[PDB]
């Protein structure tokens, strides 16, 4: 009866691993964030807008570094905010971005590289 206010789901490292190992058809965007990081407030609003634009044509998820610190380090996260763009084609390699990139830049990566 009441629509939820937030579209981006928070996933554990174990849940994210199964999502990556499993079969996917849409691009997978993974956000690493922390509630204490100031720029993550700005990034959180951009990814919610990106989820609205890509209703079912993309899957937007987020991972907290306070809960999955070891997982983030193994994923080569050097700082926050960090985004991973994972293609549904298993041969293509993922794209890792750093910093508050513009919303249009995210769309170009998803459309042209994902």
């Amino acid at each position: 009866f009441v629509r939820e206010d937030y579209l981006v789901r928070k996933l554990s490292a174990q849940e994210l691993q199964d999502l990556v190992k499993g079969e996917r058809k849409v691009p997978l965007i993974v956000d690493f964030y922390a509630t204490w990081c100031g720029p993550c407030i700005l990034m959180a609003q951009e990814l919610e807008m990106l989820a609205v634009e890509y209703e079912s044509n993309a899957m937007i998820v987020k991972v907290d570094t306070d809960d999955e610190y070891e997982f983030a380090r193994d994923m080569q996260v050097r700082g926050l905010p960090t985004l991973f763009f994972i293609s549904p084609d298993p041969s293509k390699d993922a794209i890792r971005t750093e910093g508050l990139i513009p919303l249009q830049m995210m769309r170009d990566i998803i459309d042209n590289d994902m």
């Binding site: 993550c40 993922a94 990139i101």
Partner: protein
């Protein structure tokens, strides 16, 4: 060569991107980011005055009245132009910025593996920010610049590390001072021994070093100082001040710092946010008392970039007041200027958006401190 003397910032130009990431034990709601500002006014200790990319220091240095040039590489795409247009707007020299037309700015190609039942990534192609070559260095900048500034983020890239030490050789050949602003990224917090080996070569090449209290304790012994802070006398205090149960502002002795001291080091600064600035020289040492007030503006406070403003304020005074290295009273007065710059930087959302001007910083310094401390 015009005045004020030029300063060169070396590394990657990025928008925001706080490098120093550790584990905090007080998380807010994972979705309601309107609660996250409460962590800006009760921050983790490693995030009291966070640093950032070297382009933040260059921008902040120019706003404080200095002149700065950025040395690095961006891609030939649209986001690369936005970063360059950001630094040109802030009147940062960009002749040292090289374009790589075949690369995408701030984009790293990585491959995902599933080693030992866990998900890991390995770098396939580094971004243009971490791919500046030695043949691409602008030697006119390195000849003119009096301070060469870089962070430890360049040590995470094999290409930049080789390029970094060629830039240092040229800068020293031309008489420039080397400023190492540590700002340890996430990987370098894993273990003390691996990090000390990784940074030792760049540590020895530096004439000026700025580290946070958390970085310094991590490099020497993290558990010893944590035990030291948590000690409470069982029966009575050793002095009246110990009864007040005040915050710990421990000043490290030069003998504790000795494992990190070398011959060419002129000034070591240890920052406890903007609250304390511990300074160490070959002849003397001491602490500058500062302050912070983010609760004065609870809805616009943002600590990101305040570490860069403090570093920029130090370089602004070092270039124009060379006697800071030898006079303790002069050094303390000039460091209060850096304290004021850090305070103002915490009053605005966004690092670049909130960097203060010289007159605003000078005004706050005279308002906060009594006239005898100016």
């Amino acid at each position: 060569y015009d005045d004020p003397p030029l300063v060169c910032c070396f590394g990657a130009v990025q928008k925001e991107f706080v490098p120093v990431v550790r584990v905090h034990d007080n998380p807010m709601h994972p979705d309601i980011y309107s609660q996250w500002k409460m962590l800006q006014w009760d921050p983790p200790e490693f995030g009291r005055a966070p640093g950032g990319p070297p382009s933040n220091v260059a921008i902040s240095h120019v706003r404080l009245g200095g002149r700065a040039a950025f040395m690095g590489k961006v891609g030939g795409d649209d986001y690369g132009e936005e970063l360059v247009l950001m630094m040109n707007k802030e009147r940062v020299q960009t002749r040292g910025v090289k374009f790589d037309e075949g690369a995408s700015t701030a984009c790293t190609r990585v491959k995902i593996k599933f080693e030992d039942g866990k998900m890991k990534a390995e770098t396939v192609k580094e971004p243009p920010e971490d791919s500046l070559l030695a043949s691409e260095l602008n030697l006119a900048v390195l000849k003119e610049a009096r301070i060469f500034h870089f962070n430890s983020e360049v040590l995470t890239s094999p290409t930049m590390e080789s390029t970094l030490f060629k830039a240092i050789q040229w800068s020293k050949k031309f008489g420039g001072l080397i400023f190492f602003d540590l700002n340890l990224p996430l990987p370098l917090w894993r273990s003390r021994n691996e990090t000390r080996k990784l940074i030792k070569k760049s540590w020895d090449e530096a004439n000026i070093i700025e580290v946070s209290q958390q970085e310094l304790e991590f490099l020497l012994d993290e558990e010893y100082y944590e035990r030291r802070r948590n000690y409470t006398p069982q029966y009575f205090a050793e002095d009246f001040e110990q009864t007040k149960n005040r915050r710990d502002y421990y000043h490290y002795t030069p003998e504790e710092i000795k494992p990190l001291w070398h011959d060419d080091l002129k000034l070591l600064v240890v920052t406890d946010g903007t609250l304390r600035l511990h300074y160490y020289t070959p002849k003397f040492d001491g602490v500058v008392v500062g302050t912070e007030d983010v609760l004065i503006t609870p809805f616009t406070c943002d600590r990101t970039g305040s570490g860069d403003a403090v570093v920029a304020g130090i370089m602004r005074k070092l270039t124009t007041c060379p006697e800071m290295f030898e006079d303790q009273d002069v050094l303390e007065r000039q460091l209060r200027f850096a304290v004021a710059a850090g305070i103002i930087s915490q009053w605005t959302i966004g690092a670049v958006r909130g960097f203060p001007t010289e007159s605003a910083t000078q005004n706050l310094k005279e308002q906060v401190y009594v006239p005898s401390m100016w």
